[PDB]
């Protein structure tokens, strides 16, 4: 229905705004573009980055905030797995990756209405 389509459009508008606020943050520049380094493709089976997230929003791939946060969590978990060493370069990326994840979750906790996320879930489960 039109009411359901309007609901998913509001979700996309919200997700674009959150992703924009993450992508303009200087700490998260490393996560804004797809991966220069030839061993990434063999360590990371599903690359994810904020530009790819924006593309998925516009392709209507996220019907719930949980769908979106799964890809934020993938950005973070990929970074922790590809950068596990004690070296300062690894530790810096791990710190930024957890900050990206924590920032996304915090924006959603403070700004997304629980009843709006619940409606999205109940429409998606009906399909
Ligand atoms: C989802 C909703 O807010 C809604 N609202 C209505 N009434 C209204 O006056 C419009 C302006 N909300 S009808 C309707 C509705 C639409 N598609 C499926 C189901 N289950 C309900
Ligand atoms: C597309 C993307 O990944 C993106 N990257 C940015 N990078 C930066 O600002 C620098 C600091 N890395 S800003 C930004 C962006 C995201 N959503 C909406 C708009 N208008 C821009
Ligand atoms: C996508 C990602 O996690 C990523 N990791 C890097 N790690 C490093 O450059 C070394 C220093 N840990 S660079 C980079 C881009």
Curated annotation (Swiss-Prot):
Induction: Up-regulated in breast, uterus, colon, ovary, and stomach tumors. Induced in breast cancer cells overexpressing NCOA3 or treated with estrogen. Down-regulated in 5-fluorouracil-resistant derivatives of the colon cancer cell line HCT 116. It comes from the Eukaryota. Residues 105-127 form a coiled coil. It is found in: Nucleus. Highly expressed in estrogen receptor positive breast tumors and in osteosarcoma tumors. May be a transcriptional coactivator of the nuclear receptor ESR1 required to induce the expression of a subset of estradiol target genes, such as CCND1, MYC and E2F1. May play a role in the recruitment or occupancy of CREBBP at some ESR1 target gene promoters. May be required for histone hyperacetylation. Involved in the estrogen-induced cell proliferation and cell cycle progression of breast cancer cells. Interacts with ESR1 and NCOA3 and these interactions are enhanced by estradiol. Interacts with acetylated lysine residues on histone H1.4, H2A, H2B and H3 (in vitro). Belongs to the AAA ATPase family. This is ATPase family AAA domain-containing protein 2. The lineage of its organism: Eukaryota, Metazoa, Chordata, Craniata, Vertebrata. The chain holds residues 981 to 1108 of 1390 of the full protein.
């Amino acid at each position: 229905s039109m009411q359901e389509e309007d609901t998913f459009r509001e979700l996309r508008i919200f997700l674009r705004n959150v992703t924009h606020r993450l992508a303009i943050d200087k700490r998260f520049r490393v996560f804004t573009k797809p991966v220069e380094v030839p061993d990434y493709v063999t360590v990371i089976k599903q690359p994810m980055d904020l530009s790819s997230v924006i593309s998925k929003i516009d392709l209507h791939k996220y019907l719930t905030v949980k769908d979106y946060l799964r890809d934020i969590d993938l950005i973070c978990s990929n970074a922790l797995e590809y950068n596990p060493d004690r070296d300062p370069g690894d530790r810096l990326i791990r710190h930024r990756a957890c900050a990206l994840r924590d920032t996304a979750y915090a924006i959603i906790k403070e700004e997304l209405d629980e009843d709006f996320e619940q409606l999205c879930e109940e429409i998606q489960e009906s399909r």
